[PDB]
Design a protein around this ligand. Structure first.
Ligand SMILES: O=C(O)CNC(=O)C(=O)O
Ligand SMILES: [Mg+2]
Ligand code: NI
Ligand SMILES: [Zn+2]
Length: 331
């Protein structure tokens, strides 16, 4: 078995190898990459996402989210308070202010320590989940706005024809902005490209051990667990590496820098934070191997997680028994 310790693998494709996205994903899996839950892909040196970022300040963040924490430093929840709209120019200036900027630090490790020590005492503002793309239309390789769609994957593998569309989303981050422990909707893959700015640190649990993280989360967030049988779908819970180590949960960590892709694999729980002002683009995708994970994915039926138009069809076709009760939560 390849990659039996479930380490995060890093790939350096040549420009020739960067032409066929599906094939490269299948290659990475042939080497065991999926066992980690997360892989890094460093694009060929010749490749670029776009020519410059010189005119991005005019993008609107219509609903910036202030991430307010509750709990203790290693075990907390976050709630997202909606703020008034601001442009990326406004947001970047805010990120760089004395109140919100990255503190002085020695290296990524010292900054990681400062994040876990101090996150809960601050409320950074995240411009998340903005439909759009920063890839130039002429970028032909690994352009997250030109991938094969999940609906088309389901049609090719299963023959069924469904409504829905699949488009990317932009994320504008600042110091301490946080993504809580989650898997993707319907346990899909994700791919995330860091267009610009400061790094993003990731933590991940191998898919084969995801249920160990779930059991810990039920112990650490016991009222959330009683409220919903899949409350990590709410994307609100944080658990630090120290706490994971104390409880014997297998995990890995890696820092993504500007110009790099990350791939998350089906049922790979992940969480993380941004080091400073940055912009990432991400989208879900499927392969044939995903189909069985889609059939088995948990669902939030308490109604909090409240998910997309396109996820309806996935549930209807892959989880017809759940269909009914899941759409009662989503209506
Ligand atoms: O970048 C972020 O804030 C969160 N991204 C993801 O969880 C992802 O790409 O799957
Ligand atoms: Mg602009
Ligand atoms: Ni994710
Ligand atoms: Zn729920």
């Amino acid at each position: 078995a390849q990659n039996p310790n479930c380490n995060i693998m890093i790939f350096h494709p040549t420009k020739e190898e960067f032409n066929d996205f599906d094939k490269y994903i299948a290659y990475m899996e042939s080497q065991g990459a999926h066992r980690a839950g997360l892989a890094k892909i460093i694009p060929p040196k010749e490749w670029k996402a776009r020519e410059t970022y010189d005119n991005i300040s005019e993008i609107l963040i219509a609903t910036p989210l202030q991430q307010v924490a509750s709990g203790r430093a290693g075990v907390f929840t976050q709630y997202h308070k909606k703020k008034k709209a601001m442009t990326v120019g406004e947001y970047r200036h805010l990120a760089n202010s004395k109140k919100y900027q990255t503190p002085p630090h020695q290296n990524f490790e010292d900054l990681e320590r400062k994040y876990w020590k101090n996150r809960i005492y601050n409320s950074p503002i995240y411009g998340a989940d903005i439909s759009g793309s920063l890839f130039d239309e002429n970028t032909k390789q690994w352009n997250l706005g030109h991938l094969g769609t999940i609906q088309d994957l389901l049609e090719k593998e299963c023959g069924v024809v469904i409504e829905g569309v699949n488009t990317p989303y932009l994320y504008f981050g600042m110091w301490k902005t946080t993504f809580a422990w989650h898997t993707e909707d319907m346990d899909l893959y994700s791919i995330n490209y860091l267009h610009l700015g400061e790094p993003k640190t990731w933590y991940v649990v191998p898919p084969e051990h995801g249920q160990r993280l779930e059991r810990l989360a039920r112990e650490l967030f016991p009222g959330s667990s009683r409220g919903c049988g899949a409350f990590l779908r709410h994307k609100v819970a944080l658990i630090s590496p120290t706490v994971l180590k104390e409880n014997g949960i297998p995990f890995n960590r890696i820092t993504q820098e500007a110009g790099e892709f990350m791939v998350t694999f089906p049922y790979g729980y992940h969480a993380g934070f941004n080091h400073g002002f940055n912009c990432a683009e991400a989208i879900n995708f499927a392969t044939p191997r995903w189909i069985d994970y889609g059939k088995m994915a948990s669902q939030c039926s308490c109604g909090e997680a409240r998910v997309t138009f396109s996820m309806d069809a996935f549930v209807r076709i892959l989880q017809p028994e759940r269909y009914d009760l899941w759409k009662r939560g989503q209506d």
